[PDB]
Design a binder for this molecule. Structure first.
Ligand SMILES: OC[C@H]1O[C@@H](O)[C@H](O)[C@@H](O)[C@@H]1O
Length: 396
């Protein structure tokens, strides 16, 4: 046995699978065995359940898709391996933005390797559906509702949305970023500031979320994010509020920007970039050949060729800084420009819904408040903000 790579991840949709296939291929070309542990469940909760079993099993995966502050917990447990030598040889501190490199370190040592930078705060449009409905691509919340009114009148699903908590909170966080702005967003989700969490603007975010719910399919419970994307691709819906992993579904269907889809910053979030960094935390392994395979995985993750093909298929930006951005599609080039702009000011903000801003316990509290609210058409925004602050406090 040359050594086996076992990555625990949740890349299972048609688009996500095309991306992870590029990793499988490179590992095989490098002469190692690929043994997949893909665990289906958008946003990763199902994967995390499997991980919690496997991690203290004595047979951990080579790596697992573990993001944000949660990397600190796995590092604190002593389960991850330090990557000093591979990081030095492959110049990771030079290749990675400082903001990103810090997330990957436990007590100053790399313990995880990033593969991308997803943008969460996108809105996906089907321009052909917009043309049929006489609708205008929205740049403001008011325009978003105007477009939704027209799509509805035209007999389309205005907003294709799946009723799962992480999806609900993806929409909610877009609203918070839009209404509060990036500094307010940071105060609420990173600093967990009580006055922000319970303020009039957060209250208005909940009122806006409730209205948005009136423009979704009432029987959307359980609908996977790729199902929602398909409604837009197939011309049944006008819009989807989702990160740029949605682009992977458009690309996998052979669709092109302008003609088939557009993406625009979520209305009112122009200038802000809510980032989601997929990273592979590397577990301490026992088997010598599997350690060699793991070291190969760590090398591959930031190789220029892999950074290109993975991210072309995945819908995200590459995380490596020296890349020829002209090799990506127009939407990814827009993402790059928007990242650069955001990074100059205070616009670059970690996604709460995608595990970058908070611990998982705090995220879970927020998810519960937001679905409970959106599940109840009669719910009150003033109560929601009190529950939001209270539940966050109890989760810590
Ligand atoms: O499953 C949908 C998306 O969930 C996000 O949390 C992950 O970071 C993405 O890689 C994935 O495509």
């Amino acid at each position: 046995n040359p050594g086996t790579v076992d990555v625990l991840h949740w890349w299972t949709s048609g688009g996500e699978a095309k991306a992870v296939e590029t990793l499988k291929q490179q590992i095989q070309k490098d002469g190692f065995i690929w043994k997949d542990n893909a665990v289906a469940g958008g946003g990763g909760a199902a994967a995390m359940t499997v991980l919690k079993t496997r991690a203290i099993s004595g047979n951990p995966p080579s790596a697992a898709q573990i993001k944000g502050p949660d990397i600190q917990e796995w590092g604190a447990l002593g389960l991850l391996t330090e990557l000093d030598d591979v990081a030095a040889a492959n110049k990771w501190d030079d290749l990675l933005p400082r903001q990103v490199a810090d997330i990957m370190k436990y007590d100053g040592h790399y313990v995880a390797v990033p593969v991308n930078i997803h943008r969460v705060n996108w809105l996906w449009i089907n321009p052909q559906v917009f043309d049929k409905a006489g609708a205008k691509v929205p740049t403001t919340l008011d325009e978003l509702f105007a477009a939704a009114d027209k799509l509805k009148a035209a007999g389309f699903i205005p907003l294709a949305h799946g009723g799962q908590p992480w999806q609900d909170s993806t929409v909610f966080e877009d609203l918070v970023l839009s209404i509060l702005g990036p500094k307010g967003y940071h105060a609420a989700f990173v600093d967990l500031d009580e006055k922000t969490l319970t303020g009039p603007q957060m209250t208005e975010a909940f009122a806006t979320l409730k209205r948005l719910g009136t423009y979704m399919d009432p029987n959307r419970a359980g609908r996977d994010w790729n199902i929602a994307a398909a409604e837009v691709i197939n011309g049944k819906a006008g819009m989807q509020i989702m990160g740029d992993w949605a682009k992977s579904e458009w690309s996998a269907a052979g669709k092109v920007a302008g003609k088939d889809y557009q993406c625009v910053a979520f209305p009112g979030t122009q200038g802000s970039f809510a980032y989601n960094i997929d990273s592979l935390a590397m577990f301490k392994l026992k088997d010598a050949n599997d350690i060699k395979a793991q070291n190969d995985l760590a090398k591959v993750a930031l190789e220029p060729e892999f950074q290109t093909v993975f991210n072309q298929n995945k819908g995200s930006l590459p995380v490596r800084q020296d890349m020829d951005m002209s090799k990506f599609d127009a939407c990814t080039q827009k993402s790059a420009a928007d990242f650069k702009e955001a990074a100059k000011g205070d616009g670059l903000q970690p996604s709460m819904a995608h595990n970058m801003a908070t611990t998982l316990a705090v995220q879970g509290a927020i998810f519960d408040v937001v679905t409970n609210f959106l599940n109840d058409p009669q719910a009150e925004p003033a109560t929601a903000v009190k529950q939001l602050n209270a539940a966050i406090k109890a989760a810590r």
